Design a protein around this ligand. Structure first.
Ligand SMILES: NC(=O)c1ccc[n+]([C@@H]2O[C@H](COP(=O)([O-])OP(=O)(O)OC[C@H]3O[C@@H](n4cnc5c(N)ncnc54)[C@H](OP(=O)(O)O)[C@@H]3O)[C@@H](O)[C@H]2O)c1
Ligand SMILES: O=C(O)COc1cc(F)ccc1C(=O)NCc1cccc(C(=O)O)c1
Length: 316
């Protein structure tokens, strides 16, 4: 299938990107270098991942080597929760640009709808142990994101982990200047997201699926949690197609018109995960994979459930 999807800003976004959350700083430069060498043109980043400098080393080198041109790359980052105030957004974006070695981002996302008190700590706490919100609202943060487009820092802006009412709030914002281009949400066979995906797509917003493999390296994994990569039912579909389970899990969102961003620092898996443009899941395969939904989240945000903008109380 086609390698890129057209966004509502007129730019094209590669449907397969490399994730970088948890990629160790001493391994992510080589991961991104390998990814670019084997065909990746989209890298998903974030300031909170604490490895943008090292991602940037890889990008800048592959540009210097003329393995790729800047206009062929699609680099995404995200505004962290402690930078939602309007006077902090530009500096947060500019720090990410400096670290990534870039003059512009292709896409900049509000990482989560929940703003937190600014300061050095990424999760400022009171007990008492609760995260300290900021009195920022998603609409004013969105206006600050729009400014970044108008200053040339970013080509596109979007949102992440917004529920359908929060997307609707952006779309209904008084004086809205730019619609979100993307909503990046968790999505895989255990969290299939039919309602939120159809809503976003119906509005021309492209959905990116994160944790498509079920994030087996997530730091809070428990043994009793379900495991996509080990699910016999998914392994059977992979065997039928002569592909790996991971390749099925990556192809699945692609056939729903989603972008997908599997993470790896393992060279052989980085290459494997890209070899997903040469086979097709049947409609029956797709419906079968959808049937595995259980509303299970890698990223549940249990410490934020009292935040006024917590996204996961709503059905979707
Ligand atoms: N917007 C948000 O709030 C948000 C939240 C979560 C994630 N994300 C983004 O989405 C990306 C992907 O999600 P994720 O990192 O949570 O998890 P994931 O991509 O679902 O899974 C990554 C894990 O799978 C392993 N793996 C990769 N390819 C494999 C293969 N072919 N066979 C077997 N194991 C394989 C990786 O191991 P190795 O690395 O050791 O190879 C790593 O342990 C993130 O890195 C981040 O960029 C965004
Ligand atoms: O967020 C990601 O991309 C991947 O997870 C992380 C990565 C980090 F480097 C550091 C923390 C997290 C994390 O706890 N996320 C979940 C989260 C964060 C903020 C608010 C909510 C909420 O529920 O409002 C939920």
């Amino acid at each position: 299938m086609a390698s890129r999807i057209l966004l509502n800003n007129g730019a094209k976004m590669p449907i397969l990107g490399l994730g970088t959350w948890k990629s160790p700083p001493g391994q992510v430069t080589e991961a991104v270098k390998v990814a670019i060498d084997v065909g990746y043109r989209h890298i998903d980043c974030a300031h909170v991942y604490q490895n943008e400098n090292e991602v940037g080393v890889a990008i800048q080198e592959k540009l210097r080597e003329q393995v790729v041109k800047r206009e062929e790359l699609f680099i995404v980052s995200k505004l962290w929760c402690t930078y939602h105030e309007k006077g902090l957004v530009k500096g947060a974006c500019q720090k990410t640009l400096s670290d990534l070695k870039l003059d512009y981002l292709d896409l900049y996302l509000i990482h989560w709808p929940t703003g937190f008190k600014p300061g050095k700590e990424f999760f400022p706490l009171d007990e008492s142990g609760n995260v300290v919100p900021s009195d920022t609202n998603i609409l004013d943060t969105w206006a600050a994101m729009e400014e970044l487009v108008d200053e040339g820092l970013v080509k596109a802006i979007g949102i992440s982990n917004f529920n359908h009412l929060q997307v609707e709030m952006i779309l209904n914002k008084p004086g809205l200047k730019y619609k979100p281009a993307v909503n990046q949400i968790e999505c895989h066979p255990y969290l299939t997201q039919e309602k939120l995906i159809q809503y976003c797509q119906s509005k021309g917003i492209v959905v990116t699926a994160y944790s498509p493999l079920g994030s087996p390296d997530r730091p809070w994994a428990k043994p009793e949690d379900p495991s996509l990569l080990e699910d016999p039912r998914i392994k059977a579909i992979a065997a039928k197609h002569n592909k790996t389970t991971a390749q099925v899990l990556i192809r699945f969102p692609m056939q729903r018109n989603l972008v997908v961003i599997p993470k790896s620092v393992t060279p052989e898996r980085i290459a494997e995960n890209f070899k997903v443009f040469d086979f097709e899941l049947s409609s029956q395969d797709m419906t079968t994979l959808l049937s595995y939904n259980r509303n299970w989240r890698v990223c549940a945000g249990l410490s934020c459930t009292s935040h006024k903008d917590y996204p996961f109380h709503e059905e979707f």
